[PDB]
């Protein structure tokens, strides 16, 4: 545009340009709007649809099925479709049955490979549902016990290296 080179999508703009201004910039001093030199209209410039792509998969020892998550975009700009916060998820079947989180996606959503088998999406559980009674006249006292042993593993050191510059 009259010497202002760039790429992207040109759309209608609501930027209140002054009579002597030809183009505008964002907070990083990068051009994000231009004036058309013939029509004097303002064109809003954005990048063409884009976003990170992640592949959700079980081990290839079991299957070769995948689901694809498009981050930052919903299910209308992408061209078993589920819309979550992370972005549009395609290839996974959403179910209302909750389970423990297996392959995490985000915002409470996880995926797994189950039943014949396919990739599914679900809201992850937090733990077992229970309750403790409050009372002012009753106490619970253990009548038996068990001795148990648990294992804890901690790193202490790592590989020592050296370099001849």
């Amino acid at each position: 545009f009259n010497g202002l080179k760039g790429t992207g999508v040109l759309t209608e703009s609501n930027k209140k340009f002054l009579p002597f201004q030809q183009f505008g910039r964002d907070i990083a001093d990068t051009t994000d709007a231009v004036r058309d030199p013939q029509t004097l209209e303002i064109l809003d410039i954005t990048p063409c649809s884009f976003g990170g792509v992640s592949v959700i998969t079980p081990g290839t020892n079991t299957s070769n099925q995948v689901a694809v998550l498009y981050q930052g975009v919903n299910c209308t700009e992408v061209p078993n479709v589920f819309q979550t916060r992370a972005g549009c998820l395609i290839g996974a079947e959403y179910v209302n049955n909750s389970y423990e989180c297996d392959i995490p996606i985000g915002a409470g959503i996880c995926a797994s490979y189950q039943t014949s088998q396919s990739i599914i999406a679900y809201t992850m559980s937090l733990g077992a549902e229970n309750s403790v009674a409050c009372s002012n006249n009753s106490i619970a006292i253990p009548t038996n016990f068990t001795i148990s042993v648990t294992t804890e593993i901690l790193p202490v050191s790592m590989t020592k290296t050296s370099v001849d510059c």
């Binding site: 002054l18 002597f20 030809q22 709007a33």
Partner: peptide
Amino acid sequence: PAYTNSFTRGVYYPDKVFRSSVLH
């Protein structure tokens, strides 16, 4: 030459770039 005080006058638009709600 009755020298006076310029105060805060004499500022002008340095460019033809649209900016809004920003410090430059």
